[PDB]
Swiss-Prot record, chain A:
It comes from Homo sapiens (Human). Belongs to the importin beta family. Importin beta-3 subfamily. Residues 26-97 form the Importin N-terminal domain. The keyword Plastid does not apply. Functions in nuclear protein import as nuclear transport receptor. Serves as receptor for nuclear localization signals (NLS) in cargo substrates. Is thought to mediate docking of the importin/substrate complex to the nuclear pore complex (NPC) through binding to nucleoporin and the complex is subsequently translocated through the pore by an energy requiring, Ran-dependent mechanism. At the nucleoplasmic side of the NPC, Ran binds to the importin, the importin/substrate complex dissociates and importin is re-exported from the nucleus to the cytoplasm where GTP hydrolysis releases Ran. Residues 323-373 are annotated as: Ran-GTP binding. This is Importin-5. The gene is IPO5. Gene3D superfamilies: Leucine-rich Repeat Variant. GO terms for biological process: cellular response to amino acid stimulus; cytoplasmic pattern recognition receptor signaling pathway; negative regulation of cell cycle; NLS-bearing protein import into nucleus; positive regulation of protein import into nucleus; protein import into nucleus; ribosomal protein import into nucleus. The lineage of its organism: Eukaryota, Metazoa, Chordata, Craniata, Vertebrata.
Swiss-Prot record, chain B:
Influenza RNA polymerase is composed of three subunits: PB1, PB2 and PA. Interacts (via N-terminus) with PA (via C-terminus). Interacts (via C-terminus) with PB2 (via N-terminus); this interaction is essential for transcription initiation. Interacts (via C-terminus) with human PKP2 (via N-terminus); the interaction competitively inhibits the interaction between the RNA polymerase subunits PB1 and PB2. It is found in: Host nucleus; Host cytoplasm. This is RNA-directed RNA polymerase catalytic subunit. The gene is PB1. Phosphorylated by host PRKCA. RNA-dependent RNA polymerase which is responsible for replication and transcription of virus RNA segments. The transcription of viral mRNAs occurs by a unique mechanism called cap-snatching. 5' methylated caps of cellular mRNAs are cleaved after 10-13 nucleotides by PA. In turn, these short capped RNAs are used as primers by PB1 for transcription of viral mRNAs. During virus replication, PB1 initiates RNA synthesis and copy vRNA into complementary RNA (cRNA) which in turn serves as a template for the production of more vRNAs. A motif (Nuclear localization signal) lies at residues 9-17, 25-38. Belongs to the influenza viruses polymerase PB1 family.
Length: 1095, 39
């Protein structure tokens, strides 16, 4: 009895129409257990039956599409072929005879999903009936069948296995014909969207892009026609094309640009359409800047449009009385125009944007309208970052003109001027502060103290915060008194008003300003401490209600920053009371969500108090460690939806969606990610500060941070998780080697896997640095055989990638659009690659130092790439690091390194005379380390190395700030060769020349070595150093005194004592000491006295 | 390879005092890479 089943199905669909929770649950429970084949047959029967209400049919079609796209793998295979053929034929029949547009589109979606899920293998359609139907559909007479074909093509652009072989011409003809009719506009829009989708799907295909260039005029005409009918569906397609594949527009780019300008200048369209038209050009500038830079006229015409967008300010009288930082909008014309100006200035560069916007800004800053002045000040604020280098030499007049607008008849213009000053202080730092502090600080303080408007005061205080944050401490001390005054009186007044009224806007900014001033003044804030702590605590004890939570958090942060600045000594007199306040706050507020503003201010406050209270803080660790760990391990809500379903969730509570490939939507909730990053960073700080006292919580933090390496939603979380790795090992070292081994077994596999997987270059470099540090912590047996094999494979892959990226960048050059800015971008990529090579060398050095001679068979597989790095035609950054790796091999894997000497020894000897100072330094260090840890095998090469080193040293331009370090390394190498291999040096002839080159002052670990050699020669006997009697002693004393200056560390290093004792060894007879010291500068005498006193 | 030549984090930076009312944090678009390029 199918009639009863159909009646029940219609009843449950009607229930689903207006569900409520009861029949929601009951219908879900009933539906989730229905057999798949029966489900398919019933849904097809329901779709076929054109008798029930449209809602039931649409709902059932949505069910069929969702069921297919979700679980096609279990409701299609292992079923009779008759059923499959019947359902395919039924779908085609429903498509053919459907009349209503919405239902036809839904069944088209269903059929496209089926064809997508029925491709299989390497790609070949198993449903030729579908392709045949599409072809006889698009070339038909009735418009419904053509719409069905075009929607099927748009939904899955790619129902083909041999499109290039035969079907490309047919596709192009079909699309061109469809974008030609004049009786049915709906066909033109659908064909334009289908063309955009087809081009987007077939990315990275230059031949297709050049073959489909004739369709661009039709696409532009279609989007022009559709935008005038309140339909921006094709404009979104144009934005997507410009975002993903801008090269497709290269044939007709100018035309496209003009269209956008028209669509951006037409006032008839609503705000969204004009903003999308502007976004076309903005996205083109962001993505393909080299293509856009050739059309300067379009930019010069689009800048006035954006400037005229920002004049679209509504006169609001409920402005001066606003007590909250209400969100701007991100929809109004002014904010969208300002953001577009910022993005285009950042993308195109200042060299092009600045000349055409500067005159407009200077002309608008004179129009008596209070809106043109506001727009000019906001444009000056917005173009600050993008036109950084070009505006650096013009800052004087811009600053002098902006500071004149703080004294303006209109409050909103003064607000804009404060915004401009603050943003310029942020962008042009720290050069803005040094050349303009005297006027900027005075103007901002005058604006803050004397004002009747309470929104100009807060923004002036924020500008002062931005200014003082980056201001160096040296030039702020003169202004400390004049800041503490005019910051304390205003606090007193605003705190008085907070008790009676409910004003909090300017008090928060004043509190943050005081916190910033104290933070950047450090220990100089002591005399003013008593001026602020009694009041600030008064804010924390009060302000317990709601809508003051941000004020309480800011006050607590200010208290913590003031305490950290004044230090532990002064803070430990109100520290108990502040501890009680923080404990009470923590026990009180811990009942709200994770977006509560007191959840990122309390954690940082606890970390700052830990920094202040060192080891005494261990008492409060159980209390803080609860909520911090709770908010450090929150799982963001993620949902994988369909694109047709993503629209339907337009509530937008915070969901961030991304259009995944092939009709899918991937959404994550970015609510609490920043709190997670802050909590992870504070865990890192806690471990670093506590060390041995963090051992109780080490296991939990390890088990939490190890998964966080593969947390691609936030880069800060991954960076913090990588950084915490060696600190936790150092914390767990206390419990013994077994605990260290357990933690290392937790971390090693995850770190190795994350090294060879991380997309980001910065995060990857941090991960490799952390892995190298962890290996350095645990030596001689920290890696298994599996870890060794995986590391070898990953490092070989990284070196191959580094070699291939150079060729890829070279191919990127010599392009149709290559200019200076493209070269700068390529240089930045090269710098990133060199940084990754640096981290690879760091890992190799750690492994070598830990394993010694036992690791050379593992290094055999990496040897060819390292030899490739030292090729003479390679750039100096590659050769330097190849030589560094070979130097590590020599230092730690000898005397077995002779097996590899044929690969590097001749390049090492040759590169000592290189033009690049870094390669010279690397070669000199290799030659020096050859003698110290090389044994008798490298004896004959020292005789060859010595003359080259002395020639390099004695050449001119050796002590200049560039070649100085290489010369110091060469001196150290010659000293090492003299000491450890004196048989083949003829020391009696080199040492008198060597004494001339001494001392070393900017290379620290070579300076200790050379001074150890000097002491060893002095402590032993006469040769060279002390000739006839003691007449040579004054020059060695002068050398020591000259080298005193922060070179031999005065912390009683073993070398320095051996030096100091020598100074006290001669300090027995006054006759010699007087004549040795009579020819020294007063600074030299003071240096000798300090050296004698220090050790 | 020289100790000092290793472990240098030249290309890194840090800061304090989170909030900064006057800022260019608006960043509605840009920095669009989709590091979660999986599944």
């Amino acid at each position: 009895a199918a009639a009863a089943e159909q009646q029940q199905f219609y009843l449950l669909l009607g229930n689903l129409l207006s569900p409520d929770n009861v029949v929601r649950k009951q219908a879900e429970e009933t539906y989730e257990n229905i057999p798949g084949q029966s489900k398919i047959t019933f849904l097809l029967q329901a779709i076929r039956n054109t008798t029930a209400a449209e809602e039931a049919r649409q709902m059932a079609a949505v069910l069929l599409r969702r069921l297919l796209s979700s679980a096609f793998d279990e409701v299609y295979p292992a079923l009779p072929s008759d059923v499959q053929t019947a359902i395919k034929s039924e779908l085609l029949m429903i498509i053919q005879m459907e009349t209503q547009s919405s239902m036809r589109k839904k069944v088209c979606d269903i059929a496209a999903e089926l064809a997508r899920n029925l491709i299989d293998e390497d790609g070949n359609n198993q449903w030729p009936e579908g392709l045949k139907f599409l072809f006889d559909s698009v070339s038909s007479q009735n418009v419904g069948l053509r719409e069905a074909a075009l929607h099927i093509f748009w939904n899955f652009p790619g129902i083909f296995g041999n499109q290039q072989q035969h079907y490309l011409d047919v596709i192009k003809r079909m699309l061109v014909q469809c974008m030609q009719d004049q009786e049915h506009p709906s066909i033109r829009t659908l064909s334009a969207r289908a063309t955009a989708a087809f081009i987007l799907a077939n990315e990275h295909n230059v031949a297709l892009f050049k073959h489909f260039a004739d369709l661009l005029p039709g696409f532009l005409q279609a989007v022009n026609d559709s935008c005038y009918q309140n339909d921006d569906s094709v404009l979104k397609s144009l934005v997507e094309i410009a975002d993903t594949v801008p090269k497709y527009l290269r044939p007709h780019l100018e035309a496209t640009l003009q269209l956008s300008l028209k669509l951006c200048g037409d006032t008839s369209l609503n705000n969204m359409q004009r903003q999308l038209a502007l976004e076309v050009i903005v996205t083109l500038s962001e993505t393909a800047a080299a293509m856009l830079r050739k059309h300067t006229n379009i930019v010069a015409q689009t800048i006035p449009q954006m400037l005229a967008m920002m004049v679209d300010l509504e006169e609001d009288e409920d402005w001066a009385n606003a007590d909250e930082l209400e969100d701007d909008d991100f929809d109004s014309n002014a904010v969208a125009g300002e953001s577009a100006l910022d993005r285009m200035a950042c993308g195109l560069g200042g060299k092009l944007v600045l000349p055409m916007i500067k005159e407009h800004i200077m002309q608008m800053l004179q129009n008596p309208d209070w809106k043109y002045r506001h727009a000019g000040l906001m444009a000056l604020s917005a173009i600050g970052e993008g036109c950084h280098q070009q505006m650096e030499g013009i800052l004087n007049e811009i600053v002098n003109f902006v500071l004149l607008f703080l004294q303006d008849p209109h409050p909103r213009v003064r607000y804009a001027a404060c915004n401009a000053v603050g943003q310029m202080a942020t962008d042009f730092a720290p050069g803005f502060q040094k050349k303009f502090h005297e006027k900027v600080i005075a103007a901002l303080l005058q604006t803050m103290e004397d004002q009747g408007n309470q929104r100009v005061q807060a923004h002036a205080a924020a500008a002062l915060i931005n200014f003082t944050e980056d201001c160096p401490k040296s030039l702020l001390i003169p202004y400390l008194d004049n800041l503490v005054k005019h910051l304390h009186s205003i606090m007193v007044l605003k705190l008085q008003e907070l008790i009676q009224k409910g004003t909090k806007l300017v008090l928060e900014q004043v509190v943050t300003s005081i916190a910033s001033v104290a933070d950047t003044a450090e220990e100089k804030f002591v005399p003013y401490y008593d001026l602020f702590m009694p009041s600030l605590k008064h804010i924390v004890e009060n302000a317990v209600q709601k809508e003051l939570r941000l004020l309480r958090g800011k006050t607590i942060e200010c208290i913590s920053l003031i305490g950290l600045a004044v230090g532990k000594e002064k803070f430990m007199q109100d520290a108990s009371d502040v501890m009680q306040l923080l404990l009470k706050t923590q026990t009180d507020f811990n009942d709200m969500e994770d977006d509560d503003p007191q959840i990122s201010y309390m954690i940082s406050a606890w970390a700052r108090m830990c920094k202040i209270l060192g080891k005494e803080f261990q008492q409060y660790l159980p209390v803080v460690m609860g909520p911090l760990m709770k908010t450090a391990s929150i799982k963001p809500e993620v949902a994988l939806l369909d694109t047709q379903d993503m629209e339907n969730m337009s509530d937008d509570d915070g969901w961030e969606f991304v259009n995944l490939g092939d009709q899918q939507s991937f959404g994550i909730k970015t609510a609490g990610l920043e709190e997670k990053s802050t909590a992870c960073q504070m865990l890192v700080c806690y471990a670093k500060e506590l060390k041995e006292g963090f051992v109780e919580y080490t296991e939990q933090v390890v088990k939490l941070m190890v998964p966080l390496l593969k947390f691609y939603f936030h880069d800060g979380v991954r960076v913090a998780a990588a950084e915490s790795m060696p600190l936790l090992l150092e914390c767990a070292r206390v419990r013994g080697p077994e605990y260290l081994t357990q933690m290392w077994h937790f971390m090693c596999d995850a770190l190795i896997k994350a090294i060879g997987t991380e997309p980001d270059s910065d995060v990857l470099s941090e991960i490799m640095h952390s892995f190298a540090k962890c290996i350095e912590v645990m030596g001689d047996g920290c890696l298994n055989n599996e870890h060794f094999e995986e590391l070898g494979g990953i490092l070989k892959a990284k070196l191959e990638e580094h070699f291939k990226n150079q060729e890829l960048r070279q191919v990127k050059r010599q392009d149709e659009d290559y200019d200076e800015q493209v070269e700068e971008s390529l240089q930045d990529e090269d710098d990133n690659d060199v940084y990754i090579l640096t981290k690879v060398s760091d890992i190799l050095h750690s492994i070598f130092s830990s394993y010694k001679e036992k690791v050379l068979p593992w290094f055999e597989q990496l040897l060819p790439l390292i030899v490739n790095l030292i090729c003479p035609h390679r750039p100096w950054p590659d050769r330097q690091w190849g030589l560094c790796i070979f130097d590590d091999v020599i230092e730690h894997c000898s005397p077995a390194s002779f097996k590899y000497a044929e690969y590097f020894l001749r390049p090492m000897l040759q590169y000592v005379c290189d033009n690049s100072p870094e390669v010279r330094q690397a070669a000199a260090y290799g030659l020096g380390v050859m003698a110290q840890y090389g044994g008798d095998n490298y004896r004959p090469f020292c005789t060859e190395a010595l003359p080259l080193l002395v020639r390099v040293i004695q050449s001119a331009d050796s002590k200049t700030k560039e070649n100085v370090n290489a010369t110091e390394n060469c001196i150290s190498a010659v000293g090492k060769i003299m000491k450890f291999k004196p048989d083949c040096v003829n020391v009696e002839e080199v040492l008198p020349h060597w004494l001339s080159w001494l001392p070393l002052h900017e290379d620290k670990e070579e300076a200790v070595q050379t001074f150890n050699y000097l002491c060893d020669l002095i402590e032993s006997n006469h040769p060279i150093v002390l000739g006839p009697n003691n007449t040579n002693l004054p020059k060695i004393f002068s050398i020591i005194a000259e080298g005193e200056m922060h070179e031999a560390i005065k912390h009683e290093d073993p070398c320095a004592k051996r030096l100091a004792n020598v100074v006290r060894q001669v300090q027995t007879s006054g006759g010699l000491w007087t004549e040795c010291i009579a020819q020294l500068s007063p600074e030299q005498q003071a240096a000798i006295q300090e050296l004698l006193n220090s050790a | 390879g020289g100790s000092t030549t290793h472990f240098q984090r030249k290309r890194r930076v840090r800061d304090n005092m989170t909030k900064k009312m006057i800022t260019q944090r608006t960043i509605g678009k840009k920095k669009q890479r989709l590091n979660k390029r999986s599944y």
